[PDB]
Amino acid sequence: SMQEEDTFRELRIFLRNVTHRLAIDKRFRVFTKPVDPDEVPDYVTVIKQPMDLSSVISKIDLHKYLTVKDYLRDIDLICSNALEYNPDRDPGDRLIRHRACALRDTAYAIIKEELDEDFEQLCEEIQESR
Numbered sequence: 001s002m003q004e005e006d007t008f009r010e011l012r013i014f015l016r017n018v019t020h021r022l023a024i025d026k027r028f029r030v031f032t033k034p035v036d037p038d039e040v041p042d043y044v045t046v047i048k049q050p051m052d053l054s055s056v057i058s059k060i061d062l063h064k065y066l067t068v069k070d071y072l073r074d075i076d077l078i079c080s081n082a083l084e085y086n087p088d089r090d091p092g093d094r095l096i097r098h099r100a101c102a103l104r105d106t107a108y109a110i111i112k113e114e115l116d117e118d119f120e121q122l123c124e125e126i127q128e129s130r
């Protein structure tokens with residue numbers, strides 16, 4: 001209907017605002033762009049599911065997120081990818097891992113404080129019923 005359209009627009013607006021708040025945080029500057037294949041020519045071979053905040057924005061705007069659950073799966077990728085590609089004890093790796101998973105914990109904490117559970121449930125029930 002347009003009730004349903006109104007629901008998904010509100011979701012998109014909410015997901016944009018969360019994604020913007022992550023993207024202007026200095027800690028996360030490295031996650032605002034896909035990994036450059038110049039700097040890292042083995043990344044896009046090793047990391048099957050590249051994910052970054054600019055990609056998340058594109059998916060919001062292409063209506064690929066019908067639930068916060070779907071959105072958080074992509075946020076989880078930004079962290080799990082960082083852990084997978086940068087596992088070493090050296091500070092370079094430890095810093096990207098720390099940041100990647102602080103991005104994850106920030107997104108979860110924002111959504112925990114600001115997402116109405118009943119709004120997520122409505123989104124889930126519309127999605128399941130399609």
Ligand SMILES: Brc1ccnc2ncccc12
Pocket residue numbers: 030031035039040081082085086096
């Ligand atoms: Br730059 C860079 C190098 C290594 N791993 C990375 N993981 C995620 C984002 C950027 C990365």
Ligand SMILES: [Cl-]
Pocket residue numbers: none
């Ligand atoms: Cl830096």
